[PDB]
């Protein structure tokens, strides 16, 4: 419960560990106050979030060096959060338990190794059942190979058409299908049950389209039940759409954003919702304090945070907590900072 125009954020003490590369991915645990930090310097860190800790607040649980990979993305798996799947640019990806301590190397996606020469651009569904990989072959299109993580086996494929393929995609919050931001302005509301596209619709004026997030409650249950979608472009404009206004299954081919966000001038590189569906933090990594924060459903940018003097750095990754009360920002030099949010 927080009002639209002025936020009660505050600086919690930062993470002690510093990385030798930029922070490529952050992820909070979905059950516990645990931060997973992961950089291009081959190292992941787990930190427990206790601000009254001693000797060093926000202490370190463990520090995993993964050999020879540069960690592009690490992610918790499931609502329980018992696995961490992580991947660099290399042709394999690991999964790791949190209940048994098993590192497994998935090195073969099942007859699609020609189709995949990375594993870096993956997502895992909110129900934890499935996990989509961007297949790294374009020639005028882009496909998502869907993995069953209970077996780690390919079961489905999610090709859309564009120039340079998929920009960025998001699982439906029910888990029953996808929504895929391509690189021409086409956004595909894909369905997993029918394994077919529900409908293709265009962003408002996107040249390229760079990133994409999704989330909220009380949305279209035939489109996964998640309410808001934000799509960011090469021009730094973030368009925010209510997904209840894609239905007229007949998807509106030219819908209107609920709000055009035009504050940032350079290419939107991060976008995230708070998992209660009340905040949208988006930003760029080509200017210094290029991080903005948006109240939803009202679609207003908060004007008091950040300031001139908020230490952010060139923001490479952000992450909201499981209770939507701690924000994490990791930058181009390798330092996580944390902010509690009150409401």
């Amino acid at each position: 419960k927080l009002r639209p125009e002025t936020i009660d954020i505050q600086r919690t003490r930062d993470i002690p560990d510093t990385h030798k590369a930029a922070i490529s991915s952050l992820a909070f645990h979905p059950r516990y106050p645990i931060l997973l930090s992961s950089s291009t310097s081959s190292i992941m860190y787990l930190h427990k979030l206790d601000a009254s800790a001693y000797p060093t607040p926000n202490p370190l649980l463990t520090s995993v060096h993964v050999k020879r990979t540069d960690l592009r993305r690490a992610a918790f798996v499931g609502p329980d959060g018992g696995e961490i799947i992580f991947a660099g640019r290399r042709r394999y990806f690991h999964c790791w338990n949190l209940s048994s301590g098993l590192v497994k190397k998935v090195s073969k996606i099942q007859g699609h190794q020609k189709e995949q020469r990375t594993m870096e651009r993956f997502r895992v569904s909110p129900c934890g059942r499935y996990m989509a990989l961007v297949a790294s072959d374009k020639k005028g299109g882009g496909m998502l190979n869907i993995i069953n993580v209970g077996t780690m086996q390919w079961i489905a494929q999610a090709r859309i058409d564009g120039r340079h393929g998929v920009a960025d995609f998001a699982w439906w919050s029910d888990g029953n299908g996808l929504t895929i931001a391509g690189r021409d302005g086409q956004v595909t509301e894909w369905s997993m049950i029918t394994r077919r596209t529900v409908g293709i619709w265009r962003d408002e004026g996107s040249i390229g389209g760079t990133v994409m997030a999704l989330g909220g409650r009380n949305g279209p249950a035939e489109l996964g039940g998640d309410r808001w979608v934000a799509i960011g472009s090469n021009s730094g404009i973030l368009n925010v759409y209510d997904r209840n206004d894609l239905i007229e299954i007949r998807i509106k081919k030219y819908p209107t954003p609920t709000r055009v966000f035009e504050q940032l001038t350079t290419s939107i590189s991060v976008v995230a919702f708070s998992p209660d569906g009340q905040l949208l933090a988006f930003g760029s990594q080509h200017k210094k304090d290029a991080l903005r924060l948006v109240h939803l459903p009202s679609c207003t940018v908060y004007r008091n945070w950040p300031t001139e003097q908020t230490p952010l750095g060139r923001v490479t990754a952000i992450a909201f907590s499981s209770k939507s009360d701690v924000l994490a920002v990791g930058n181009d030099v390798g330092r996580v900072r944390l902010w509690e949010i009150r409401g």
């Binding site: 099942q110 069953n148 079961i155």
Partner: protein, 284 residues
């Protein structure tokens, strides 16, 4: 014929002399359990326990368990011919040339279809479905049924009237099983290659090089690890997508719009404040 446990961490292998259980997590054999020959099958008990069911080549029904050595004393010989085939359900049924349950050609094998029961009998080219190419092996999945038959050649016919040819093997097939959620058809062969039939978008991807040994494969109780029986007297619990053996067994409103409510018609000649209030509250 090898079989897992209900809690996945125990593998179960019959030899030509005894029954040996194994740790899927850590080590080799746990129990040498006595089982003389003075072997047809061994499955688990279905409804309440997980004891065992072993049938020898003639009628001697061993009802024997792990977590003990109990059951080394009680066979049963209710049937008169040498036992050929054997299947349990929940309720036991045994193929002798015909069934006894609780026909033209030579029998091969017999398998049982789950709780709303059905029976699948197997002669050479005949196959008997019961509601209530020359065969080598076959598996099945329910939910309303699908039957994958192998063959003495490398053709794997699939049935849900018309089969489907899934021919890969340059000899007999020795193993055909449905994978997990039914997406893949994991098959084996004489030529050491464990083929993963895609059965979706019709591709094939496999585990080629191995100890010249593939016959009698089995699938985990979950979608996880397949255990392989292996003709060099070896079993091999392989976790999935590793293909590495785990076990080897050998109200926001901008102020300027309210300023725009109060810009024109300065104090006098303004609309009355019922109307101006309707402008303001209509802005809010």
């Amino acid at each position: 014929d090898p079989i897992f446990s209900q809690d996945e961490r125990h593998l179960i292998i019959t030899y030509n002399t005894s029954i040996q259980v194994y740790s899927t997590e850590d080590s080799l054999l746990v129990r040498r359990i006595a089982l003389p020959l003075t072997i047809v099958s061994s499955a688990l008990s279905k409804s309440n326990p997980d004891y065992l069911w072993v049938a020898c080549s003639d009628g001697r029904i061993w009802h024997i368990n792990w977590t003990s050595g109990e059951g080394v004393d009680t066979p049963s010989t209710i049937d008169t011919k040498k036992l050929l085939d054997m299947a349990v359900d929940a309720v036991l049924l045994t193929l002798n040339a015909q069934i006894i349950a609780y026909y033209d050609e030579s029998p091969q094998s017999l398998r049982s279809v789950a709780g709303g029961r059905a029976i699948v009998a197997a002669a050479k080219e005949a196959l008997h479905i019961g509601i209530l190419d020359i065969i080598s092996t076959f598996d099945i999945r329910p939910i309303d049924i699908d039957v994958a038959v192998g063959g003495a050649r490398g053709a794997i016919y699939v049935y849900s009237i018309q089969p489907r040819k899934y021919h890969w093997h340059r000899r007999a097939v020795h193993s055909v099983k449905w994978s997990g959620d039914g997406n893949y058809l994991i098959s084996g062969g004489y030529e050491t290659v464990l083929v993963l039939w895609q059965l979706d978008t019709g591709r094939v991807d496999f585990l080629p090089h191995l100890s010249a040994a593939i016959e009698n494969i089995v699938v985990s109780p979950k979608g996880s690890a397949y255990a392989l029986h292996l003709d060099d007297n070896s079993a091999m619990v392989l976790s999935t997508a590793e293909m590495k053996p785990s076990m080897y067994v050998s109200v926001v409103v901008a102020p300027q719009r309210l300023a725009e409510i109060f810009n024109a018609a300065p104090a006098f000649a303004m609309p009355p404040i019922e109307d101006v209030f309707y402008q303001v509250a209509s802005l809010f």
